[PDB]
């Protein structure tokens, strides 16, 4: 995020980091329950990648993080790699997340819910802060 | 890249207005947000765009794509969760 600010630690408890086996953060995701993470299809997750829950500072060794293995990747069959439309994947975890003060689920909308233009929302992540 | 988790608040746009920036690249399963002095950027992909509804944070978008320079005057593009939630529910029910 460019021109954002640091979050309060633990205040976005559904936010996860997807890391490859070298420890490199490549995408975010969100917990929707103890067993499932939603992310973008174009992130290209495999069962060799790791879901990291409960993290704030990726440079810290002292945080009580959960490193969760992925059982299966469910890429939405409507995903179109040419247009990047329908850009959603579900990850079924091999090991359930343990919910706590710093790890919990985001709500999903109903299909008919309305979010009007001009509404102020929030986005979070460990993406670049400057290009 | 930051070590520490970042946040930003930003407004939702309509798809019709987002098309002024991105043209025919914007599809019905996309939602735009930003152009407000902040931007999502590389490495944010897959993470949440949440809006508060009836006191609870609700997943409205999934960070998807946007400007190759993360311009803060151009809207970012997110997967529109309301268009995708029926598939989420079917997948969870079957697995």
């Amino acid at each position: 995020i460019v021109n954002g600010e640091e979050a309060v630690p633990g205040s976005w408890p559904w936010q996860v980091s997807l890391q490859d086996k070298t420890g490199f953060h490549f995408c975010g995701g969100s917990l929707i329950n103890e067993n499932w993470v939603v992310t973008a299809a174009h992130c290209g997750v495999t069962t060799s990648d790791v879901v990291v829950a409960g993290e704030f500072d990726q440079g810290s060794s002292s945080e009580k993080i959960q490193k969760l293995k992925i059982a299966k990747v469910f890429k939405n069959s409507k995903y179109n790699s040419l247009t990047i439309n329908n850009d959603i994947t579900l990850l079924k975890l091999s090991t359930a997340a343990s919910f706590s003060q710093t790890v919990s689920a985001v709500c999903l909308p109903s299909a008919s819910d309305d979010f009007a233009a001009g509404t102020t929302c929030v986005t979070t992540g460990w993406g670049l802060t400057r290009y | 890249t930051p070590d520490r988790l970042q946040q930003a608040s930003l407004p939702l746009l309509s798809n019709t207005n987002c098309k002024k920036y991105w043209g025919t690249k914007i599809k019905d399963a996309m939602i735009c947000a930003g152009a407000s002095g902040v931007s999502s950027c590389m490495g944010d992909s897959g993470g949440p765009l949440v809006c508060k509804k009836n006191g609870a944070w609700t997943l409205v978008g999934i960070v998807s794509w946007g400007s190759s320079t993360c311009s803060t005057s151009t809207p970012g593009v997110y997967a529109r969760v309301t268009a995708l939630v029926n598939w989420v529910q079917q997948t969870l029910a079957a697995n």
Partner: peptide, 4 residues
């Protein structure tokens, strides 16, 4: 454009 670029994936994010």
């Amino acid at each position: 454009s670029w994936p994010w």
